[PDB]
């Protein structure tokens, strides 16, 4: 609980609808503080272009997610007198820790988060059509390997895109397997959760990584972060603007290993974590809750009167 260092964690982007965060984005002062910096950087009204946007993972939904997580990261610090000794981000979380850790100016982070959002939009129009990430829980490592074996035997391209907990994985493959897979997951007595499409959080995009480096990450300018940053790929502790740059590019070809992040934060003497942003996984799942005293800085918690 209080018997060690506090960490500041940034969650992966869930399906965020203006509906869920709207009132908070215009109420909360930290959001308004950043939204103005962001509107300046972009030359449009992010809230207005988010509000009237389509989908779950829009270009503007992505920017907004960064604003909210970072704002909530600050909000949490001031209101609850937190002083993090180390920070970490999962997938999109990387974009949030970038800004927070100081590794990038907040305007650079916005430029980046925008640039990547647009590179992916344009990517998934032609590449990985019909590919799908399947989230599922109560699938112990022994029982997954039985299913992965059948895919090996069927010769069906597949990738464990995120390791979340011992019995909790995201599996990316072609949709021609979706019904098949859910069938087998229920057989072993696991529970399917969600089918992402296009598979944004997958890590099999060598093509994208190269084009992202040219058009988005290269023109940017990365300072050493003001505190250590743990990497979703391997759990390595970064301390240099360059290592951060890599962390972001690596996420196109290197899957999330959440256990390794926890294992690593534990090694760094952490007992308390503040999951800053609309989360329902990285704050809630066992891997985190077994190891740390969680503080979900949700937009719901920010609007709670006292």
């Amino acid at each position: 609980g209080a018997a060690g260092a506090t960490a500041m964690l940034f969650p992966g982007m869930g399906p965020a609808a203006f509906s869920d965060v709207g009132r908070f984005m215009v109420t909360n002062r930290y959001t308004r503080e950043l939204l103005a910096e962001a509107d300046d950087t972009l030359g449009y009204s992010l809230v207005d272009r988010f509000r009237q946007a389509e989908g779950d993972y829009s270009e503007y939904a992505q920017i907004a997610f960064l604003v909210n997580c970072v704002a909530l990261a600050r909000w949490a610090e001031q209101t609850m007198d937190l002083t993090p000794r180390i920070c970490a981000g999962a997938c999109f979380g990387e974009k949030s820790v970038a800004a927070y850790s100081g590794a990038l100016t907040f305007a650079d982070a916005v430029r980046m988060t925008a640039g990547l959002a647009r590179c992916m939009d344009e990517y998934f129009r032609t590449e990985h059509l019909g590919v799908v990430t399947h989230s599922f829980v109560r699938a112990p490592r022994e029982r997954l390997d039985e299913i992965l074996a059948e895919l090996d035997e069927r010769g069906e391209w597949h990738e464990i895109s995120c390791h979340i907990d011992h019995d909790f994985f995201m599996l990316t493959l072609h949709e021609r397997n979706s019904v098949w897979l859910e069938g087998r997951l229920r057989s072993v007595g696991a529970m399917p959760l969600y089918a992402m499409r296009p598979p944004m959080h997958a890590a099999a995009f060598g093509g994208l990584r190269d084009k992202a480096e040219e058009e988005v990450i290269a023109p940017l300018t990365f300072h050493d972060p003001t505190l250590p940053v743990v990497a979703d790929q391997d759990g390595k502790v970064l301390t240099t603007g360059d290592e951060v740059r890599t962390m972001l590019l690596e996420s196109f070809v290197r899957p999330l290993r959440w256990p390794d992040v926890i294992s690593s934060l534990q090694d760094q003497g952490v007992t308390r974590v503040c999951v800053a942003g609309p989360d329902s996984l990285f704050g809630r799942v066992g891997t985190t809750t077994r190891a740390f005293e969680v503080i979900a800085a949700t937009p719901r918690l920010a609007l709670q009167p006292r």
Binding site: V137, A190, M191, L193, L281, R284, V285
Partner: protein, 95 residues
């Protein structure tokens, strides 16, 4: 093992006992989500209404699989959406 401790009690005392246990783990599972929730909870109100998410549902299912030592479906909290109905279902299994 469960049937042991049940036999000897009225059908209604078995209701009471099971509903009491499914409550104990429902508040426990509900503490992980927001520790702000009280130590007791209205056992007739559906789980999602009380503030379960997908991960609490699976958390309850472990605790109940744990104590009862029974074959409960992972989705037990979804298929039987109120503590009372989970206790209802648990009895039916045990006998």
């Amino acid at each position: 093992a469960l049937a042991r401790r049940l036999a000897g009690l009225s059908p209604a005392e078995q209701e009471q006992h099971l509903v009491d246990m499914v409550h104990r783990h429902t508040v426990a599972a509900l503490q992980a989500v927001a520790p702000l929730t009280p130590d007791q909870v209205d056992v007739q109100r559906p789980f999602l209404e009380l503030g379960f998410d997908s991960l609490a549902a699976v958390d309850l299912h472990k605790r109940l699989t744990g104590e009862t030592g029974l074959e409960l479906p992972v989705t037990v909290a979804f298929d039987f959406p109120t503590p009372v109905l989970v206790a209802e279902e648990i009895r039916r299994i045990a006998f």
